[PDB]
Subunit: 494 residues, 3 copies
């Protein structure tokens, strides 16, 4: 008739997702993303990090030079992958502080070996065994030299090697533990051995232990592996009177990003920055629930399987009660499921007809704030390489308990941080979208000084004759109240 | 007279509690809970966890089989409790890596012992001492076998025991350290002993040390305790030429939730899930300030003695200035101390009389949001069992420094998390209660289109004749402005 | 003319600082502080902590009593400072568990030495060497006693020392490692040494190692340093048959706040509570980016170089478009750069003239909330003394990896806490300043019931004749609407 109705509202959707905030345990929204990566392809991608697959070789057999591990000489890696089908097929051995040696060689990232001229005098070199067959003949570790009595004598050995280079040199050496008192004299003339290996600042002395051990590949004897690092400017001395497994050369040492991982996943051709023991995962999401062990740029490990970030507004599903008069309704009531052009918009009822449109500035302002919110506080990426061990096969006691306690403390503190951040950010999102709605209302109310009244459905009963051009002026922000003031005041108050 | 007054407000209380928020260091509220448990009954509750009280026995004397500890054979526990009055009354001994053995046996949770048929040949078994009297006679540890020379000989001993079962076997053994060179030959024919104990993958060799030590229970000699774990499929070999304290059998090994705690509190009949060394505490509150050492489902340890969570709204104490005309006042002014039915409510001044009532929907909405707020972010419970040691009696150096540094880092990071969460949640509570108040006001203002005006005390001067039925209609949400519009407009503007 | 204009606004500045919030990556403010200390004077301040500068002495040479370190006898410290130019000039030595001994002596905080009467019988005391010249003569460590054969004999030594005091006693002792089999017999008659040192509860036995090592100051022989702690009530026994470096007395042991730091900064006269290896830094700011190593009350280490806390409101720079009519504009439009008396204020356009003033209560309320905000959640100070090592010169393996992993976990968790707190607090600051603005508006609107209208520039077109006294009444809070109601209603609606 003589008056007009102009209402404000926001878009609704039929199928919405539940989220969690500070104030409510579940609310419904128009749209929500996932922030926890729960899946893996099950394969290890070979770019961009250099992957070296050990097949039946451990890293400690590859370094000593076991015969089925001779493909690995002078190799380099970013990540070394060990398989659970790996075995040993040479002289039986133990390494005191095995975990320490494995970690030191993994972080160096190379098996570069330089043969040096060591002069062993009055002894027979290149000792062998049928526990280590290289071809039909007997053999031994390619990087160690078994020394034994020449004629009926083993002289006190005294050799020196100086570092005049500008890098560090790692020497691997050992000692033979014979099973009887009748084997010692047969190989090394003496009855009790001794091996001393020293620099200017450090020393180690080992004595051999004699007695019977379980049979492994036809022997009840064992070797024990040791190591020494010689710095630039320092000297090495070796002084043994019996039972010495001599070094043949040194290994170069580098500082870099190299590491080691126990996996059973196949290796494939693809590009992925994060590797887990369950295969490579993508790094688009900030958190991950696949595995606590990782390498390269990776998401943070949390205990949760799902965290949903509200990327839209609240979803009051349109009351399916469609008015008989098709009464335009507002935001205080419900959402509008018939709006596609934008989030916030205007519906006008006029003599001319019913109509609809969308507001660009309001929608854009909400979208710009919402895009990249998580990016503001937590970092895009976090690269880590060589870390600690997080899974154990044996019981050890104190140090293993401390390692397990340090990892659990870290996981519980990053899981609490991930729960609070999603609830805080979800709250702030619902608040900014709701204030934006009420901001367009106050703007509309301010332009209509005394020529409109509020109904409380989210609607402004305008008390003059508004045509399409007049509605368009309000929408734009050029509505001139003075023109229709007299007519509206005479219509509303009399 | 011809007009009416309708005011909105919220309840006040006389005695209120101070809280802390992001924005203010102290604010007064109607009601507040405590979140830090500061007290204990001083007793250890025997349900639901199985408590085994050691009386004068340590866990390492119970395992070796000291005579005053024979009540403990084949025992099982969830928590083992050690007392400060505990002592030793057998052969004097030391355990290298004592802390490691104590932690391994505590997490297993049993003293199940299976005697095995070991054949010691050419030696005299069941050696004894008057430092360990079981009855009037001499005695020894019930689980160890002291072996000595038969006639004038001690043969090289070589025995083997295979694991064909499907579980792990823990063997405890040792070595005797005699005080002179004249005692060695007297017991074991040789002048220098040796004990080797090996599997397929591991070995240990110990040599004995001779010399004088302080007198303990009439002896200057000592025993040293060692241990070996044999996995399913593996073998054990023992090869000693002198000074062997032989094993008698193995201990079963389990993986579970068992642990050990040093306390002096009495044990009583009651049900409590959390145990501390100061007695059992309840687990209703999220944080605790009693002790950093804990077992079972327990609250998190923080440094603070008090953290108060606002469970009510702000408390503007009713200005005791009671108006002479008894002028109804609103929320912008003060609180209402005369309201019991609900938090938010209406007071009406009419020709009929003064009156009061309460609003249910508004009060319920505030209460539902406030109930269970903390439950949304922090977890209800956190069960932990075997952890690290947090109190030390000796100085050790590096490892102890790292253990103390790891615990302090955890406490400072959980104390900062507990301070921020209470301040954040308290802020959000005050905000939601204040917005709820302003929401009922806008609802009231919207229903009274042009028949009422705002005074600014929190009151609506209605400009027609409102009776009890009219006030009731506003309160309900069925007020029909059109009926009194003409009368009110003629009364207010002319 | 017949009407008046009264507008509300807030102060603007020309040069503003960008900050970061939850909702926006950069916003402009009137004023902002820095919270990260990035600079140091480069000197170590000598008050209030007692600094003891080692010059060419390490703490382990000062304790043994090397000749160039005799100024350090009976010294005490809170912090001991080691220099990179330090060297050794006595008998060459190694300490097994060197890191453990250095940490134990540093936390005690004294070199107090009590000479005790030990009776060495049948041996020659005060052995010497030209590797340690004290004057022209040969010399040795001042706190150790080299013992050697008297005539042609070295008796088995058996001595005892009881603790009857009420404090702990630290004894430092050692063993000589000779380079040949011809040097052993020459000094100590036997061919193989032994040193046993025991209490009632503990024992250590060391055997000497013979062989050649690199030359240091004309010797191929070395000493190995050991230690024992004897508690109140306990006894010490020493039982050596050769190669004993005997103790001369004990060191007192204290529990306190003492520590050690490797620095190269000069020591100066000034007062500073926090010391770093880059010199003393002030502790006014909560975070610091100078160094992860610290001593005393210090700010927390974070990875960031800058974190800016908004201490003012938002800065909408005054549109330099100055109205031709000099139209007073409000807050919805821009800020006011012409206001110095306060933040929030009123500008009045009247027949009398244009004018300006400031509101005290509103400005004060905002300032009081903003002052000390950070103080509410994070603690003013955090004192720490003896901690762990955070920089290493050698590769060691497992324990060093765990130490490095524990420090990185702590740094990443405190850097995430510092990023979120600044973004949260900055958001809350912008919100409280903006609500304060809208609170003065509603107060102004409420006082002008029907005698004013809103324009939407932040202005109230008052529809009567307002003079300076009338404007002053509004500003005060004594404006009486009734007086001008009839005139304003006849002017605005007709
Ligand atoms: C101290 O005590 C230990 C433990 O008792 C002794 O160690 C044992 O020594 C014997 C003799 O060396 C070892 O016996 C050998 O076992 C080999 C492996 O056996 C496996 O494979 C065979 C074939 O499949 C199976 O039958 C068997 O069950 C195992 O699965 C055998 O292959 C060896 O065979 C040799 O002898 C036979 C004789 O018939 C010949 O036909 C062969 O050609 C070959 O020469 C042999 O039987 C035994 O394994 C050791 N046990 C362990 C676990 O260590 C020490 O000998 C003892 N030392 C001293 C000094 O007393
Ligand atoms: C190397 O050096 C060490 C240290 O000097 C020597 O060790 C000492 O050896 C002697 C002899 O074995 C020990 O003496 C014994 O002490 C026992 C405990 O004494 C406590 O209780 C008594 C009674 O209450 C108190 O008087 C005393 O103050 C203590 O509180 C005594 O009970 C023993 O008594 C025996 O001898 C007496 C003689 O009168 C008889 O009446 C008794 O029946 C009994 O046979 C005895 O006196 C002494 O404790 C050791 N000290 C320590 C601390 O070890 C080594 O002997 C020495 N070794 C060599 C090889 O030289
Ligand atoms: C086992 O094997 C080791 C390693 O080979 C041997 O150790 C070497 O032993 C020799 C002899 O003791 C050491 O030689 C000595 O070196 C001293 C230091 O040399 C430095 O300074 C000089 C002078 O500036 C430089 O020329 C040199 O390059 C070094 O920078 C010399 O000062 C000693 O001099 C002595 O002899 C000379 C002879 O001309 C006299 O003039 C002097 O007065 C003085 O008496 C001497 O040359 C050598 O350093 C050892 N090397 C290492 C690194 O240990 C063991 O001897 C050997 N042991 C056995 C038992 O076989
Ligand atoms: C493993 O690597 C070593 C070291 O070689 C270095 O590392 C490799 C991975 C490559 O990057 C090389 O380019 C790099 O130099 C190899 O040692 C090398 O061995 C050869 C043969 O013994 C040496 O050649 C000798 O040179 C001398 C003259 O100096 C002649 O007298 C000899 O007749 C002979 O030609 C070469 O110098 C040496 N390189 C060194 C020491 O750097 C090693 O062969 C290699 N092994 C395998 C299996 O690949
Ligand atoms: C400690 O426990 C062991 C092992 O017994 C097992 O653990 C207990 C806590 C209970 O749960 C038992 O049900 C469980 O089996 C006891 O060992 C047992 O000892 C007895 C007596 O030596 C064995 O009986 C023998 O059986 C053989 C036939 O196999 C006969 O020839 C013998 O004459 C005799 O009857 C029994 O088999 C054995 N159980 C085993 C090995 O599992 C042990 O006695 C017990 N000690 C105490 C003090 O309670
Ligand atoms: C290092 O310190 C010790 C211990 O002295 C104590 O610590 C100091 C830092 C000061 O605070 C002292 O006040 C404190 O006591 C010194 O030991 C002392 O040595 C002297 C000389 O040998 C002892 O005096 C003797 O006393 C006896 C009688 O008991 C007489 O028979 C002797 O003739 C002689 O006068 C003094 O008792 C002793 N103090 C003790 C044991 O506490 C030490 O001299 C000192 N060294 C240096 C270089 O300063
Ligand atoms: C990625 O690989 C890891 C293994 O490296 C997978 O974790 C493993 O998941 C299984 C199934 O949940 C766990 O088995 C269960 O163990 C418990 C405790 O022993 C037992 O009670 C159950 O009956 C069952 O055997 C297994 O323990 C677990 N391994 C570890 C060490 O956590 C993980 O599921 C894989 N993830 C993906 C996404 O593929
Ligand atoms: C629960 O039991 C623990 C002990 O297991 C109690 O902690 C102890 O409290 C006392 C009193 O505060 C502390 O004593 C003080 O120690 C300091 C530092 O040495 C000293 O300067 C004081 O003079 C006083 O002796 C004691 O150290 C502390 N023990 C520990 C290891 O923290 C605790 O109070 C008990 N709590 C409850 C609620 O019962
Ligand atoms: C306070 O002193 C510390 C040293 O104790 C200073 O840290 C050092 O800063 C320099 C320059 O950034 C670092 O050098 C660089 O190291 C990297 C990695 O090796 C290398 O790639 C670069 O080429 C360069 O050499 C040095 O490593 C670093 N030291 C440590 C251990 O962090 C610090 O800058 C000083 N701070 C102030 C405020 O004076
Ligand atoms: C909900 O908002 C998210 C924003 O993360 C939209 O997510 C994108 O959806 C498309 C669909 O093809 C994906 O290809 C993109 O990778 C998503 N992310 C980005 C980077 O835009 C999602 O489309 C929105 N959902 C609806 C229904 O609009
Ligand atoms: C303040 O609110 C708390 C909510 O925690 C009320 O606390 C309850 O008080 C009763 C009093 O008998 C206890 O028995 C309950 O255990 C408390 N908790 C629960 C679970 O309801 C408290 O009553 C309120 N105070 C006032 C004055 O109303
Ligand atoms: C911005 O607010 C800060 C509050 O931290 C003001 O900082 C003070 O500035 C004076 C300038 O002489 C310093 O001496 C003080 O140490 C600062 N802190 C305190 C404790 O007041 C700063 O002045 C303000 N800036 C402006 C332009 O007003
Ligand atoms: C208000 O609503 C109640 C039902 O909740 C009803 O009993 C009462 O009659 C209503 N009062 C009116 C319409 O005045
Ligand atoms: C406003 O209040 C002040 C006191 O703060 C007073 O001096 C002044 O006269 C008052 N002005 C009025 C009522 O116009």
């Amino acid at each position: 008739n003589s008056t007009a109705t102009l209402c404000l509202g926001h878009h609704a959707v039929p199928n919405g997702t539940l989220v969690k905030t500070i104030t409510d345990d579940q609310i419904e929204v128009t749209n929500a993303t996932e922030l926890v990566q729960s899946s893996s392809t099950g394969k290890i991608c070979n770019n961009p990090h250099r992957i070296l697959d050990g097949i039946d070789c451990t890293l400690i057999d590859a370094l000593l030079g076991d015969p089925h591990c001779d493909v690995f000489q002078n190799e380099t890696w970013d990540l070394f992958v060990e398989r659970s089908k790996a075995f040993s097929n040479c002289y039986p051995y133990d390494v005191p502080d095995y975990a320490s040696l494995r970690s030191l060689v993994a972080s160096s990232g190379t098996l570069e070996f330089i043969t040096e001229g060591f002069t062993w005098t009055g002894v027979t070199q290149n000792g062998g065994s049928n526990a280590c067959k290289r071809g039909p003949g007997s053999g031994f570790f390619s990087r160690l030299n078994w020394l034994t009595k020449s004629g009926s004598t083993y002289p006190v050995l005294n050799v020196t090697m100086p570092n005049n280079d500008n890098f560090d040199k790692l020497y691997i050496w050992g000692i033979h533990h014979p099973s009887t008192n009748q084997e010692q004299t047969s190989l090394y003339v003496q009855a009790s051995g001794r091996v001393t290996v020293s620099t200017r600042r450090s020393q180690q002395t080992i004595i051999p232990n004699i007695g019977s051990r379980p049979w492994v590949r036809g022997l009840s004897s064992r070797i024990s592996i040791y190591w020494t690092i010689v710095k630039p400017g320092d000297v090495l001395v070796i002084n043994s009177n019996g039972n010495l497994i001599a070094p043949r050369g040194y290994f170069k040492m580098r500082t870099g990003k190299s590491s080691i991982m126990r996996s059973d996943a196949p290796i494939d051709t693809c590009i992925s920055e994060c590797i887990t023991p369950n295969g490579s995962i993508p790094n688009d999401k900030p958190f991950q629930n696949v595995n606590k062990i990782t390498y390269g740029a990776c998401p943070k490990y949390v205990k949760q399987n799902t965290l949903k970030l509200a990327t839209g507004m609240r979803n009051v599903p349109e009351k399916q009660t469609r008015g008989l008069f098709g009464a335009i309704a507002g935001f205080i009531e419900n959402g509008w499921e018939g709006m596609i052009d934008g989030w916030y918009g205007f519906r006008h009822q006029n003599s001319e007809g019913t109509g609809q449109a969308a507001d660009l500035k309001s929608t854009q302002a909400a979208i710009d704030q919402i895009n990249g919110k998580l990016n503001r506080v937590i970092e895009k990426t976090n690269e880590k390489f060589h870390q600690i061990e997080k899974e154990f096969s044996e019981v050890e006691g104190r140090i293993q308990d401390l390692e397990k306690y340090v990892e659990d403390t870290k996981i519980d503190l990053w899981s609490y941080n991930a729960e609070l951040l999603v609830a805080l950010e979800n709250q702030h999102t619902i608040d900014l979208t709701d204030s934006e709605m009420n901001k367009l209302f106050e703007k509309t109310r301010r332009q209509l000084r005394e020529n409109a009244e509020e109904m409380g459905n989210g609607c402004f009963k305008i008390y003059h004759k508004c045509d399409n051009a007049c509605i368009e002026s309000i929408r734009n922000g050029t509505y001139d109240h003075d023109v229709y003031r007299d007519e509206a005041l005479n219509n509303r108050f009399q």
